Design a protein around this nucleic acid. Sequence first.
DNA 1: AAAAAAAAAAAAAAAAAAAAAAATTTTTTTTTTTTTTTTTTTTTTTT
Length: 341
Amino acid sequence: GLDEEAEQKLFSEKRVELLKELSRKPDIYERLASALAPSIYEHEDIKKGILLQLFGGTRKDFSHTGRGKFRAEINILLCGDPGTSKSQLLQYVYNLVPRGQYTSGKGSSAVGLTAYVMKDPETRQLVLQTGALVLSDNGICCIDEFDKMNESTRSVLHEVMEQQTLSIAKAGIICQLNARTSVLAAANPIESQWNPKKTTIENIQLPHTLLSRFDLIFLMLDPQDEAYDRRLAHHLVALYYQLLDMAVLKDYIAYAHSTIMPRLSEEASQALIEAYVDMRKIGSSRGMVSAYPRQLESLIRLAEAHAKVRLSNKVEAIDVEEAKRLHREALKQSATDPRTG
DNA sequence: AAAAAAAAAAAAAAAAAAAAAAATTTTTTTTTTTTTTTTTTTTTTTT
């Protein structure tokens, strides 16, 4: 938790040195990703995105700039029919992270996600009560069935995912709560399956603004691969007839949050500028998910997260390259083409 | 056929009128009992 991380005397010197060694290993990113969700098979890119979400970005103070808070959290959307493990991933994140809230389909409303007023049935006084997003203030909100979610409740997430605040202006009291939550959304394709006769944007069926608010989108498409099918079948049967330890995973993440505060190096800055220009060029097509300065900030956040994963404390070219590669492989820019579909 | 907007339903909280509920010993009178007294009457003593 936040309090445990804030407390200084949390790790022994031996444990700190062990964590530093693990960060000094070459494939720590792959190791942590494989550690995540051991019961779900071969979602390497998705688990890397989840790991970067857990590590978060670099919290920055922009009060002097007069610019407004900057979201350091990583928002991830998963897209795929109800045959993939998107819901399982959301459940795993919910059961893993502290301050994890869960929502699904139409089982939520705007007031029930932000705040409301109830007569305290022990003092007979009208007290204000928080919603799921506020309850997961410094944690993660996992929103399954994000497609079957009416606009009235879906529109609240704009403020949460953009400003990390929540300005409730009702009769009694008007106040700006803080919901610095990380969104892990899961949405189904139109007609509950990814038909290969439609382009990605229409298959997703989400507003451009809502999709831009996400810094990662993973299209969990289904490749008709006999090898993949056989490996998954063996995985599941072995699961029925049944590593990197969770303890050291916790210690690594807590240490990274406590100490590592990655900053931008010159090479990383130039790489990010070039990457954003190239991303705009590639995404200026018709059916592709376009790119914006929001995507530039998404790359910045992912680079900071990778720096945290490496305990670098300095964002650099390798981090930027990993951010770009992840942001492309997720959303499968390669498999697409100017003639989107 | 689905999404967005409108309207309705259900439910909870607050206010006003009207019926209900709670609190509430002291003071004066007066009757009976006892005692006191004035007169009548009866008894005893004396011549």
